[PDB]
Every structure is written in structure tokens, then in C-alpha cells.
Amino acid sequence: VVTEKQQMLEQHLQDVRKRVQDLEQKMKVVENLQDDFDFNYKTLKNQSVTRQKMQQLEQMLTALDQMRRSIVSELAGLLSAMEYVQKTLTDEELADWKRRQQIACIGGPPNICLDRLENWITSLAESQLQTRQQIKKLEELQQKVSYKGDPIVQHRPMLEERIVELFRNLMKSAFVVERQPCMPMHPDRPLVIKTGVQFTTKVRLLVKFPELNYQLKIKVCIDKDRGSRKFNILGTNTKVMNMEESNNGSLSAEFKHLTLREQRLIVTEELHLITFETEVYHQGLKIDLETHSLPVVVISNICQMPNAWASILWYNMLTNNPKNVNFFTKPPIGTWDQVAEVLSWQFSSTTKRGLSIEQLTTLAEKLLGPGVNYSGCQITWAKFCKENMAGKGFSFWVWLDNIIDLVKKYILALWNEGYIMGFISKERERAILSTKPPGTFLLRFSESSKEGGVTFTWVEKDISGKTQIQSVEPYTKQQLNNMSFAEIIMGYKIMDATNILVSPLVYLYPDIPKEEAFGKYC
Ligand SMILES: CC(=O)N1CC[C@H]2CC[C@@H](C(=O)N[C@@H](CCC(N)=O)C(=O)NC(c3ccccc3)c3ccccc3)N2C(=O)[C@@H](NC(=O)c2cc3cc(C(F)(F)P(=O)(O)O)ccc3[nH]2)C1
User: What effect is documented for mutating residue 39 to S?
Assistant: First the structure.
């Protein structure tokens, strides 16, 4: 959906193109008038007819001055308009995409499409090129014909400085990281790179100039410019930028043959920047392009992956700054609503279902204790990942990451259909089951299991009539590799008072008969 701010920008660029094209027509007229004055001056050098020719030359030069004064001020007004539209395009519209990329990297909505920004940047770049050529023409014209108080002599140096500054800054802004450094075997976990593992990245120049095809050599490196680990990028660290049919004519450079090796604070919290460099030589201008990736965590073993991903989650959730390498020296605090958004993204990016309101509320209570409104609550790096949970030998994130993995690899189909209540407190599960008939059950995750465990809580009535709520010992990942959770639910039997094996499970919460819900999976 196109915004009001974006539609106003589309018209502002079209108005710039119209102004640029109007000045081109004025440039033609001023050149023809000067060419006529130059010709008539150099020629014809009854004797009072020479006095009439002199009056014609004076009138032509005064008309030349007025046309020059007009063009100069028309160009000054065009540059001011270009400056405003560029600030909206680069400092606002481009920055939003950069933030949208940070969010998409975590597991947020993938709205990071460059096609609209490439079209806007190219349009502004083509208009600025014609303007730079018009200012070059004024220099050419002045050399041939000039006079005391010439508007070109006094205002062209400023006009030239302004367009050159505009074009350089637009070229520098257009050099972006389209696809952040990521390991192909871990696509859902970018910005985490293990040493010795082949990794890919992609860069794009949003100024769609066919002149630049096969002309830009992109150099990639790591740790350019206390006691921090230094690394080197090995493999093919130079790529020539080219226009592809696959990119739809876009200038890009994809690096697929990269690896990190240590050169000759905690590892999961140490951040590094992967830098891209090139030089553009366009019609007399040397523009030095330099862009960098979002901070990367460099790991040595794949066991470090969970804690490394949490550092990326914290960074991209809390800051919009793309180069804060010292972020974890004093990490910022997050709100519950900020954290809850990220936690639901961990599930919606890997599965067809994110986290529900009830699941997020029980997750809020696990970290902050009892309450009703968690919107005014705060979660620190220590409560999330750095330190172990209260009364437990593992952190909240490690416990949660093992659940995400359990869902993704062992109980995906059940999670995707909504048969997993997942996160429900001991008090709340007893409450919602108390009303329901005997044999009603819900599926949830273990809180004491570090590696991840799945359980089912059911309700029944004793001889006395008192309602009893019990859970089964959590089924481990090893057990889920032999039998599916669905087969375990159906096959579960208990020893009755009559000493007969019976299934204590009849309806899945709220009233779904077990065979209707789990029969299709066994
Ligand atoms: C007390 C009661 O009414 N129960 C019935 C009896 C007991 C004793 C046997 C056990 C049971 O049913 N075991 C399962 C296997 C479970 C597993 N994880 O592998 C079972 O099917 N047992 C069979 C059997 C038969 C042959 C060989 C092996 C096992 C069985 C069937 C019939 C009779 C006896 C045994 N069976 C049970 O799990 C009973 N419950 C528990 O022991 C238990 C529940 C629980 C919940 C959590 C948590 F919620 F997730 P958290 O957030 O981490 O705190 C943590 C630890 C927990 N322990 C349920």
C-alpha cells in the first residue's frame, strides 16, 4: 500500500523532472541568443548603419543578461527543491527500509523491497545529472561571452558546489546491503557467522545507471577501522557489480565465496562489521562508496549459535544505529511489549503460527512475576539471556530456543493447526480445566526441562467427587524421534482403580474428541 508521504514524494520528483526539462529549453534559447550575439559581434567590423548594428548588439547583450539572471535563479530554486526531496528520500524513506530490514532479519514482516526506492533514487540521479550538465554549459557559455556583473561568474561556483554535494551524497546513500551476511545452512538466523563456514552476502547500488555496468569493483573485508578478536575474509573478496535479468536490471554484487579466519569481552556479545568499498568515476567525478553490514557475532562452534542469536535479537530490537559495536558494554533495557513482539516473531517466521495473547501473558509472568498489565514492565539483558532464571540452572532464552527447535523439528503439524496450548501457568491450566468435563486435556511445554519437553495436563473426578488435575512426565526430543506426540497422546494408558489400562484422555481443549484431532497423525 502506497502512503500519502510516498505519493507526495512521487509528485515532488516528477515536479523536479519537469523543472529540469523546462530549464533545458531555456538553456537552448540562451545558447542561440549568445551564438547570434557572438556571430554579429565578430562580423561587419551610410556609415551610420554601423551605429544601428551597435544598438542591436547592446540590446542582444542586455537580453542575454536577463536570460542568464533568470536561469541562474531558476537553477538555485531547483537545487533547494532537490535538497528537500533528497532529505525526505534518504533521511526518511531509505532509513525506514533500513529499519524494516533490521526487523525482517529478526523474524518480522518482510516488507524490505528496494524496487520503489531504486525508482525514486534513479529519477533524482538522472535529474541531478542533467542539472550538473546545465551548470557545465553555463561555464562553457561564460568563457565565450562575459561582462562586468555576469550572473554566471558570481553564482555558478555555488550552483556547482551544491549539485556536486547532492549527487555525491545520493550516490553514497544508494550503496546498500540488500542481503545481510548469513550462512546458507541457517537462513532464519542472519548476522551470525561461524569461522571456516562458507557465507553469502549481497550489495546493491540504487542509482540504476547502465553506464556503470561491469565498472564497479566491490571490495569486501572485516574489522577495517580494545582487546577484541581480529578476523580476515578469505575466498573471493572482490566482485564486479553487474545488471542481471534476475535482479530486473538492478546493479548488484553477490558474494557467495566468503569465510572468516582469525588474524595472526564475551565471544557471543562481541560485534564486528563487514565493510564493502568501491570508487565511482562518473563524468569527471570521483565518488568513494562505502557501506557496512549490521553488527555480526563471530562464533567458533555451532553450540554458541543460541546465545549469538539472542545478541542479534537484542541489538536489532532496541537500536536503529547500524554500527554500535560496543552495544553490550552497557546493554539497553527493553519493554515487555518490545520483547513480546520479537518472541512471537521467533514462531511466525519458522511456523504458520506466532504467539497468542494467552501464551505471551504466561511468558510475561515467567519473567516478571504476577500481574495483569505488563505494558509498563521492563526486561533486561540479564533476565533474558546473560543470567540464568530464578531458581533454575538455565537462562530464559536457552529454554525458549529449545522450544522453538522442538516446535520446528518435532511438533510442527500440531503447532500449525493450533492444538498446542504451549505456554500456560500451573494456576491457569488448573482454572480453565476445572470447569471442563472429565477427560479434557491440553498440550504444553515443560518449564523445568532445559533441552525441551512436551506434556499433557488432564482433569478427572475421584470416588469422593473432587476434581483432580495431573500432568505426564515431559516427553523428551529423543522420545519424539521414535513416536510422534500425536501417537503418544492416543497410546497413553493409565492403571485404573479396577487395575485395568485405560486412556485418561477423551477431549482436547475445549471439546474436540481426541480421535478427530490426533487420528490424522497416526
Ligand atoms: C501422578 C499421576 O497421576 N501420573 C500417573 C503416574 C506416573 C508414574 C508413571 C508416569 C507415566 O505415566 N509415565 C509415562 C511415560 C512418560 C515419559 N516421559 O516417558 C508412561 O506412559 N508410562 C507407562 C510405561 C509403561 C511401560 C514402560 C514405560 C512406561 C505406564 C503405563 C501404565 C502404567 C504404568 C506405566 N506418571 C506420570 O508421568 C505422572 N506425572 C509425573 O510424574 C510428572 C508430571 C510432570 C510435569 C512437569 C512439567 F509440568 F512439565 P514442569 O513445568 O517441568 O514442572 C515436570 C515433571 C513432571 N512429572 C502422571
Answer: In ADMIO1; uncertain significance
